[PDB]
Symmetry: C2
């Protein structure tokens, strides 16, 4: 029998979660969510077995500007510590330079999560002021977008986030949501995750539209033969609408 | 170094002939979103190119009897073009035989029709025959319907196939004209619908997106340009240059 593939992932509702149960669960049986359903479809169509492992450092992945090293799921793939990353992992220029991605299984963009009842309507409006703090997940794609942007509004926002980083950069989306709920703080968040959150907490809203456009893809080490195979499997699922059905299943609930 | 041969197809606002009273020659004949994209790719990757319209006028589909591809897809399979730079949908059946860059635009199939009617979805079309409907022959929309297992879309394919000589058309332009001049709904890509409805205030999109797909640059399978073009697209997207190009070419109605 062929070696089981090691699949790195990260906890992020409704993509990847621990199942609720009173008895202890083991192995792959611990996990559920959209990305777990996707993994299951990939494994049956491509004919592999797998072991799910949560990324050890708890990060998506960014490059350190001083020493040039990556972290997170991206680094696990670079180092061949995982065969695949099946997660809400954004396909980005800087990541595509060092790892391979399948074509996207979902498309999205950065937007803003905030409390209802405000005249703030856009990133421009946030950038012009400092009473309302704002931030993003540390060492993820949203942070990196702001750090690399040459657009004046976003450059200004990065200077603020960077100055205040110990307070405004958070370690998970969950922590960002709690900051929105417990302080005067707006969270720069991926739009598909905002959709999930605002359907379940009717005090919160999206502010403005999408700031960029990107996709989530399955990550592989650079050169992996699984990359193109997984692209084909994803495209075949899209011929029959099975990914939008999986999205409906995990985003169903609202406000 | 050798200029890459770029296959393309006329499709507003992606690729058009420039208007002028004097004759134009070579690459200078063309403009549009995809032409602006090609220029950016060529500067960033450092190649020169020659644009050639696909001779058969097709995007590309597989013949159900003899297994041959046509259109831009066939030009790439046969190594007659180095790149296809066009509103060319990335699809499973195409990806099996050619390579694509990652998407420069995302979209889905939807419906173009007149305003003011009770038709609100594909299901409403599928259950009747008074209002005819169709798609571009030998494109990705047609192929989606031909391959679909979903009952509504399978019923719609049976109708299109029965009525093909009348309801399958050779271009989006032809499909628009059928909507405007007969009781006909056109199954059309949503970014093209957005362009059309901004300029035909009696037309509208019906329902939402029927599927999810992207447009990518096509290459022959195994080409080294595929990954380089993906990186250049991704770099344009980290600065919002593609949405600005979209805005330039899409530019309304009361
Ligand atoms: N999905 C992101 C993390 C969340 C965010 O950056 O907003 C990533 O792939 O890095
Ligand atoms: N863009 C399509 C043609 C138009 C359509 O099929 O709606 C293709 O790549 O085949
Ligand atoms: Cl509000
Ligand atoms: Cl889908
Ligand atoms: Cl098949
Ligand atoms: Cl790819
Ligand atoms: Cl963009
Ligand atoms: Na790569
Ligand atoms: Na391919």
């Amino acid at each position: 029998s062929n070696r089981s593939l090691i699949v790195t992932t990260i906890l992020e509702e409704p993509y990847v979660l621990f199942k609720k149960s009173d008895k202890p669960l083991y192995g792959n049986d611990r996990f559920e969510g959209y990305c777990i359903d996707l993994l299951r479809e990939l494994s049956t169509h491509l004919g592999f077995t797998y072991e799910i492992r949560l990324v050890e450092d708890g990060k998506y992945g960014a490059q350190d500007d001083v020493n040039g090293q990556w972290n997170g799921m991206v680094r696990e793939l670079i180092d061949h510590k995982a065969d695949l990353a099946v997660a809400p992992l954004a396909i980005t220029y800087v990541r595509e330079e060092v790892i391979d991605f399948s074509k996207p299984f979902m498309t999205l963009g950065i937007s803003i999560l905030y409390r209802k009842g405000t005249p703030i309507d856009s990133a421009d409006d946030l950038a012009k002021q400092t009473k309302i703090e704002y931030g993003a997940v540390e060492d993820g794609a949203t942070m990196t977008f702001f750090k690399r942007s040459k657009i004046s509004t976003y450059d200004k926002m990065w200077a603020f986030m960077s100055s205040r980083r110990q307070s405004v950069l958070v370690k998970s989306n969950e922590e960002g949501i709690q900051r929105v709920l417990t302080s005067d703080y707006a969270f720069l968040m991926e739009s598909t995750t905002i959709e999930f959150v605002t359907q379940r907490n009717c005090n919160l809203t999206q502010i403005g539209g999408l700031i960029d456009s990107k996709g989530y893809g399955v990550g592989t080490p650079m050169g992996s033969p699984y990359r193109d195979k997984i692209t084909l499997a994803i495209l075949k699922l899209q011929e029959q609408g099975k990914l939008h059905m999986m999205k409906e299943k995990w985003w169903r609930g609202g406000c």
